[PDB]
Amino acid sequence: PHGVVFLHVTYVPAQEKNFTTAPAICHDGKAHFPREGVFVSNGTHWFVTQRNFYEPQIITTDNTFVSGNCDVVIGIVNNTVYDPL
Amino acid sequence: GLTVLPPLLTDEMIAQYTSALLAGTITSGWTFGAGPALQIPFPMQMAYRFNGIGVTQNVLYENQKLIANQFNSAIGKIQDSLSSTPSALGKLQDVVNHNA
Ligand SMILES: *[C@@H]1O[C@H](CO[C@@H]2O[C@@H](C)[C@@H](O)[C@@H](O)[C@@H]2O)[C@@H](O[C@@H]2O[C@H](CO)[C@@H](O)[C@H](O)[C@H]2NC(C)=O)[C@H](O)[C@H]1NC(C)=O
Ligand SMILES: *[C@@H]1O[C@H](CO)[C@@H](O[C@@H]2O[C@H](CO)[C@@H](O)[C@H](O)[C@H]2NC(C)=O)[C@H](O)[C@H]1NC(C)=O
Numbered sequence: 001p002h003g004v005v006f007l008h009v010t011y012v013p014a015q016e017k018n019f020t021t022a023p024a025i026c027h028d029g030k031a032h033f034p035r036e037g038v039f040v041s042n043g044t045h046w047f048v049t050q051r052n053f054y055e056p057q058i059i060t061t062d063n064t065f066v067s068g069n070c071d072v073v074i075g076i077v078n079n080t081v082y083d084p085l
Numbered sequence: 086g087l088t089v090l091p092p093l094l095t096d097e098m099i100a101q102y103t104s105a106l107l108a109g110t111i112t113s114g115w116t117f118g119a120g121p122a123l124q125i126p127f128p129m130q131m132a133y134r135f136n137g138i139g140v141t142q143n144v145l146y147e148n149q150k151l152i153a154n155q156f157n158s159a160i161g162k163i164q165d166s167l168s169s170t171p172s173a174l175g176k177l178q179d180v181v182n183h184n185a
């Protein structure tokens with residue numbers, strides 16, 4: 001009658017989970033960083049997942065990029081990076 | 086007949102709110118502002134903010150110590166400037182002086 005009512009439809013993340021994360025993956029003397037997501041681990045295996053929704057994927061060279069060696073990154077861990085070739 | 090009414094929220098409660106905001110933004114980044122607080126290592130969060138400004142994560146991860154040192158030096162300089170500037174809080178002082 002004298003104003004406006006906005007119905008805001010928003011996305012609220014829910015049902016979080018513990019995960020072990022690392023800044024980068026050390027493989028063949030190279031440091032791999034996720035292109036779009038984050039490295040996580042359920043306890044035994046390492047995956048790369050997107051940000052606001054848990055979707056674990058195999059860490060490959062397509063979803064990661066290489067920058068330098070493993071000497072400078074603090075918290076880097078060893079894990080294998082799959083090469084689809 | 087002129088009196089001053091105390092504010093509803095004390096300085097202690099405002100400080101507690103500020104400390105809660107600080108803890109949330111330090112331990113969870115921007116997640117606690119949009120929903121549940123999701124814990125995250127702080128260097129990873131700063132790499133996130135580097136991504137937001139268009140800088141890759143490796144730039145941060147190869148210069149983490151330098152970035153931390155620069156941040157600490159900037160915080161110290163801010164404290165020193167606020168302590169030494171003759172008129173730094175001029176807006177709040179002007180509001181109080183106008184009311185008085
Ligand atoms: C993570 O790995 C590094 C590097 O080791 C390389 O990768 C491994 C997966 C394996 O293939 C090694 O043969 C490779 O050399 C580890 O650093 C080594 O640490 C040991 C003792 O811990 C030391 O004797 C080696 O010289 C180190 N390697 C090098 C190249 O300097 C590192 O310890 C691993 N991290 C964890 C937590 O296990
Ligand atoms: C972490 O997730 C991985 C997903 O690959 C799990 O490993 C798989 O587990 C299933 C379930 O038995 C097996 O069928 C697969 O063969 C496993 N894959 C590999 C490569 O071993 C793993 O078990 C999970 N770890 C935890 C602690 O939950």
Ligand SMILES: *[C@@H]1O[C@H](CO)[C@@H](O)[C@H](O)[C@H]1NC(C)=O
Pocket residue numbers: 015016017018
């Ligand atoms: C995540 O880890 C913390 C560590 O104590 C734990 O309290 C919390 O319940 C965990 N969250 C989930 C969803 O498992």
